[PDB]
Design a binder for this molecule. Structure first.
Ligand code: MG
Ligand code: MG
Ligand code: MG
Ligand code: MG
Ligand code: MG
Ligand code: MG
Ligand code: MG
Ligand code: MG
Ligand code: MG
Ligand code: MG
Ligand code: MG
Ligand code: MG
Ligand code: MG
Ligand code: MG
Ligand code: MG
Ligand code: MG
Ligand code: MG
Lengths: 140, 84, 37, 122, 84
RNA sequence: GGUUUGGCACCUCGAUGUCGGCUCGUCGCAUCCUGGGGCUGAAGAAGGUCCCAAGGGUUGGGCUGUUCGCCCAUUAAAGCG
RNA sequence: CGUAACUAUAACGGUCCUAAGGUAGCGAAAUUCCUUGUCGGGUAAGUUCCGACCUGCACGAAAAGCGUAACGACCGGAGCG
RNA sequence: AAAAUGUAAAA
RNA sequence: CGCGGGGUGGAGCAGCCUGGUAGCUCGUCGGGCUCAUAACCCGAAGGUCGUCGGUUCAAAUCCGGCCCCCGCAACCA
């Protein structure tokens, strides 16, 4: 799936997503990247769905770079129960994404392909996306 | 009902096939008379007990005999020469 | 595909005529006819 | 005026003696059944060896009714019982004979065999 | 080590007692080279793909080739010729 | 969307009678028939899928308190709220 | 937990525990949750009813057990008139 | 004291 | 799911409370008694202690998260 192999704590608070992006705002790996326009919690399985989606498209092709990692535990209470009596049990994991974060990067494939492969992945996603090239990403 | 021999059976059978054809053909003759419908058939079926119990015996040529086991498809030949 | 909310082009002979306020998609073959409803 | 639950005297030798009207086969909600209308039914009591056994769901044509039939010519005909004649899916009589008079409404309704067979027709 | 014989994997060796025992010789020789060498030596014993996933085919002549399938002590017989 | 099971505990505990049926309806359309129509892997008759459209229709029994179901015999259909 | 000629099932056995492990007879019952159990029967159609089978959630011997002619403004299922 | 059973081919 | 009990050789049970190696009966194995099989007698080997982590110098044992087994509770409208 994709989830921390171990954790200091098993349940962690929610906290709000405030603009910016803090990191991964520039490419740094492949030739084409996919960035987030709006903030959200991406589920460990929205990723895997986008990832697969990518390869599914260009079979035996380039290399895919998953720039984000769902390390935050998503809680949920049992169906039909009242408020209280503790915090829910963990239902799955997510990764906090903010406008500017590059989520996926492909390399080793014709532009025309990377455009599609990434485009498809954007669909398996809860937020709006924008594809990129590799120009001024020269912080290195 | 797949056929299954074993150590003492294949060796028991090879000797029959390479020492006398009168009983080789007689042996597999019953194997076909069983393979389909076990128990009832030729030779002279008869449920065995003790040493064999779960094994069945088909009278062949008096002295000689053939022991087997039936199990929802898959027979099991155990012996070809000697009384019991 | 007569009706949907994602009328796109399918074949290279598919036109995106826009009549009666609706975004139809006329094409050489019927199976491609559409209408964004 | 036959309706479901009504008992019909069977006027033929299909072996059956009495049938219960299960349903009237006219419209999709026909209220009653009369001379010439077809009906589905249950055999309520039949004779020993017979083409029909009780418990069988059959089909038959009403041939006699206790409620007078009105004739287009202002006359009326009424019988002492409510009888029918079992027929098959092709609407042909399952029996070889028919007993007691029958209403000529039976002809225009298109049941010739029964009419010819009938000993009298009023 | 018990010996296995499918339905079709039986009538073969069985009709070989009516039409030249030559081919029989192979069966037997091949059988023993398999009791101590699952799939080594004689007939350049090799494995199989797709259809026969996990089946090792031993060379009898060049056409026929009895495919075995050892497992927890038990040599299987499937087809001495054609296929399944 | 607000028909289900719930969450919340806002009017109502100086009382808002709380299932099912019967009678009387009326409204919605996400249409069960019937009316128009586009594709179809539509030859034809018959179907499938989507679109338009409630004007009017939308049966009688067996079982169970049942709603619901299942079954019998029908039907143009035996629509859902 | 294991075991008999496919399968099934287990008269038999092994072991742990008890004060002792429910006998006869009844058994989806005024008791059976799953359940409208599954076969019959009755009906055109039967969640009820009657007869059976028993994996008896959760009968069982004097808070009696299983029956029983007669009796009943008792509760159930059927016909005929 | 007490101690069970029986290997299936009749010329 | 809410409570509490329990997964230890092939089977069925001890050991866990009192952390420092594992016991009991049956079975399995080798050998006798026998004409032979039981029974009987002699002597054997066999246990990752459900699992993934923890505390400890050391975990079957103590703390934890899941995983199946068993048993109770699921009431008033
Ligand atoms: Mg057996
Ligand atoms: Mg009868
Ligand atoms: Mg509500
Ligand atoms: Mg309040
Ligand atoms: Mg408050
Ligand atoms: Mg109140
Ligand atoms: Mg008031
Ligand atoms: Mg209710
Ligand atoms: Mg509409
Ligand atoms: Mg016992
Ligand atoms: Mg019952
Ligand atoms: Mg109940
Ligand atoms: Mg009735
Ligand atoms: Mg009733
Ligand atoms: Mg009694
Ligand atoms: Mg004897
Ligand atoms: Mg011994």
């Amino acid at each position: 799936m994709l989830m921390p192999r171990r954790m200091k704590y098993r349940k962690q608070q929610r906290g709000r997503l405030k603009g910016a992006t803090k990191g991964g705002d520039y490419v740094a790996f492949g030739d084409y990247g996919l960035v987030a326009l709006e903030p959200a919690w991406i589920t460990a399985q929205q990723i895997e769905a986008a990832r697969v989606a990518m390869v599914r498209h260009f079979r035996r092709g380039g290399k895919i770079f998953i720039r984000i990692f769902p390390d935050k535990p998503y809680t949920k209470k049992p169906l039909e129960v009242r408020m209280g009596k503790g915090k829910g049990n963990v239902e799955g994991y997510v990764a906090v994404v903010k406008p500017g974060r590059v989520m996926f990067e492909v390399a080793g494939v014709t532009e025309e392909q990377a455009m599609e492969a990434l485009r498809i992945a954007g669909h398996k996603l809860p937020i709006k996306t924008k594809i990129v090239r590799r120009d001024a990403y020269d912080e290195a | 009902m797949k056929l299954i021999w074993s150590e003492e059976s294949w060796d028991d059978y090879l000797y029959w096939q390479e020492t006398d054809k009168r009983i080789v053909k007689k042996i597999n003759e019953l194997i076909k008379d069983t393979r389909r419908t076990p128990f009832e058939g030729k030779g002279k079926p008869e449920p065995l007990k003790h040493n064999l119990s779960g094994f069945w015996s088909r009278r062949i040529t008096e002295e000689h005999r053939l022991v087997y086991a039936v199990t929802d498809d898959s027979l099991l030949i155990a012996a070809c020469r000697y009384h019991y | 595909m007569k009706v949907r909310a994602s009328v796109k082009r399918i074949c290279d002979k598919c036109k995106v005529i826009r009549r009666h306020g609706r975004v139809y998609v006329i094409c050489e073959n019927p199976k491609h006819k559409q209408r964004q409803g | 005026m036959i309706q479901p639950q009504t008992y019909l005297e069977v006027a033929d030798n299909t072996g059956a003696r009495k049938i219960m009207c299960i349903r009237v086969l006219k419209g999709s909600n026909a209220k009653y059944a009369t001379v010439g209308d077809v009906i589905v039914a249950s055999v309520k009591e039949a004779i020993p060896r017979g083409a029909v056994k009780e418990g069988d769901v059959v089909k038959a044509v009403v041939v006699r009714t206790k409620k007078e039939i009105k004739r287009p010519d202002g006359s009326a005909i009424r019988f002492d019982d409510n009888a029918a004649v079992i027929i098959n899916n092709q609407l042909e009589p399952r029996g070889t004979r028919v007993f007691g008079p029958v209403a000529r409404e039976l002809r225009e309704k298109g049941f010739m065999k029964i009419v010819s067979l009938a000993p009298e027709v009023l």
